[PDB]
Protein backbone atom coordinates (compact mmCIF):
# COMPACT_ATOMS: atom_id res chain seq x y z
CA UNK A 1 0.00 0.00 0.00
CA UNK A 2 1.10 3.57 -0.68
CA UNK A 3 1.18 6.26 -3.34
CA UNK A 4 3.44 6.77 -6.35
CA UNK A 5 3.44 10.49 -5.71
CA UNK A 6 7.19 10.29 -6.15
CA UNK A 7 6.47 11.36 -9.71
CA UNK A 8 5.74 14.89 -8.59
CA UNK A 9 6.74 14.81 -4.90
CA UNK A 10 5.17 12.33 -2.46
CA UNK A 11 3.15 13.74 0.43
CA UNK A 12 1.35 17.02 1.02
CA UNK A 13 3.35 19.81 2.65
CA UNK A 14 0.38 21.18 4.65
CA UNK A 15 -0.31 17.90 6.49
CA UNK A 16 2.95 16.12 5.71
CA UNK A 17 1.10 12.90 4.95
CA UNK A 18 1.15 10.62 1.96
CA UNK A 19 -1.38 11.37 -0.73
CA UNK A 20 -4.28 8.94 -0.23
CA UNK A 21 -7.02 8.30 -2.84
CA UNK A 22 -9.51 10.63 -1.15
CA UNK A 23 -6.65 13.12 -0.70
CA UNK A 24 -7.33 14.43 -4.18
CA UNK A 25 -3.77 15.68 -4.71
CA UNK A 26 -3.24 18.86 -6.70
CA UNK A 27 -0.19 20.62 -8.12
CA UNK A 28 0.21 24.35 -7.53
CA UNK A 29 2.06 26.78 -9.87
CA UNK A 30 4.89 26.88 -7.35
CA UNK A 31 5.49 23.18 -8.01
CA UNK A 32 4.12 21.92 -4.74
CA UNK A 33 1.64 19.09 -4.52
CA UNK A 34 -0.82 18.99 -1.64
CA UNK A 35 -4.19 17.63 -0.55
CA UNK A 36 -7.06 19.46 -2.19
CA UNK A 37 -8.68 19.87 1.21
CA UNK A 38 -5.34 21.19 2.49
CA UNK A 39 -5.15 23.46 -0.53
CA UNK A 40 -8.51 25.06 0.34
CA UNK A 41 -7.28 26.95 3.47
CA UNK A 42 -4.18 27.77 1.41
CA UNK A 43 -6.13 30.50 -0.38
CA UNK A 44 -7.03 33.70 1.58
CA UNK A 45 -10.61 34.70 2.40
CA UNK A 46 -12.11 38.13 3.06
CA UNK A 47 -8.49 39.27 3.33
CA UNK A 48 -5.68 40.62 1.16
CA UNK A 49 -2.08 41.84 1.29
CA UNK A 50 0.35 43.79 -0.89
CA UNK A 51 -2.51 44.70 -3.22
CA UNK A 52 -1.79 47.58 -5.59
CA UNK A 53 -5.51 48.02 -6.24
CA UNK A 54 -8.88 46.32 -5.78
CA UNK A 55 -8.47 43.04 -3.91
CA UNK A 56 -5.61 40.53 -3.95
CA UNK A 57 -5.89 36.82 -3.26
CA UNK A 58 -8.96 34.61 -2.94
CA UNK A 59 -9.65 33.27 -6.43
CA UNK A 60 -6.25 34.32 -7.67
CA UNK A 61 -2.86 33.65 -6.09
CA UNK A 62 -2.75 31.13 -3.25
CA UNK A 63 -0.52 30.97 -0.20
CA UNK A 64 1.62 27.87 -0.21
CA UNK A 65 3.36 26.57 2.98
CA UNK A 66 6.54 26.42 0.88
CA UNK A 67 6.79 29.74 -0.97
CA UNK A 68 3.69 31.30 0.57
CA UNK A 69 3.23 33.38 -2.57
CA UNK A 70 1.85 33.07 -6.09
CA UNK A 71 1.51 35.23 -9.19
CA UNK A 72 -1.40 33.48 -10.89
CA UNK A 73 -3.71 30.57 -10.26
CA UNK A 74 -3.36 29.16 -13.78
CA UNK A 75 -1.71 25.99 -12.48
CA UNK A 76 -3.43 26.12 -9.09
CA UNK A 77 -6.01 23.68 -7.70
CA UNK A 78 -7.56 22.55 -10.98
CA UNK A 79 -4.77 20.78 -12.80
CA UNK A 80 -4.77 17.64 -10.65
CA UNK A 81 -2.38 15.23 -12.37
CA UNK A 82 -4.03 12.09 -10.97
CA UNK A 83 -4.23 9.78 -7.96
CA UNK A 84 -0.95 7.91 -7.59
CA UNK A 85 -2.41 6.43 -4.39
CA UNK A 86 -3.32 2.75 -4.30
CA UNK A 87 -4.04 -0.04 -1.83
CA UNK A 88 -4.02 2.60 0.91
CA UNK A 89 -5.48 1.53 4.25
CA UNK A 90 -5.01 2.34 7.93
CA UNK A 91 -4.58 -1.34 8.75
CA UNK A 92 -1.62 -3.43 7.59
ZN1 LIG B 1 -2.28 17.83 3.28
ZN1 LIG C 1 4.64 26.78 -2.99
Amino acid sequence: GGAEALELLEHCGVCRERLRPEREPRLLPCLHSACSACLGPAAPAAANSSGDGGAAGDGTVVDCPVCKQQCFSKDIVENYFMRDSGSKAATD
Side-chain angles (χ1 to χ4, degrees):
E4 287 172 344
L6 286 162
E7 290 172 346
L8 304 180
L9 255 156
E10 252 216 63
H11 48 268
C12 163
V14 174
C15 66
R16 318 242 264 182
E17 301 298 330
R18 204 80 60 78
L19 298 169
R20 98 194 283 185
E22 291 174 349
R23 205 96 270 189
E24 188 176 356
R26 233 147 190 173
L27 188 122
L28 262 63
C30 51
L31 218 180
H32 299 134
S33 302
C35 319
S36 178
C38 289
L39 291 173
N48 63 357
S49 180
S50 299
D52 289 347
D58 198 17
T60 58
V61 314
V62 179
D63 306 309
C64 184
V66 187
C67 46
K68 263 108 158 175
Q69 184 179 354
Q70 256 296 134
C71 294
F72 311 103
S73 15
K74 290 191 292 294
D75 289 347
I76 213 106
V77 280
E78 258 156 20
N79 283 284
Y80 62 98
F81 177 82
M82 236 204 313
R83 292 194 298 277
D84 289 347
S85 71
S87 298
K88 195 269 196 295
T91 63
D92 97 290

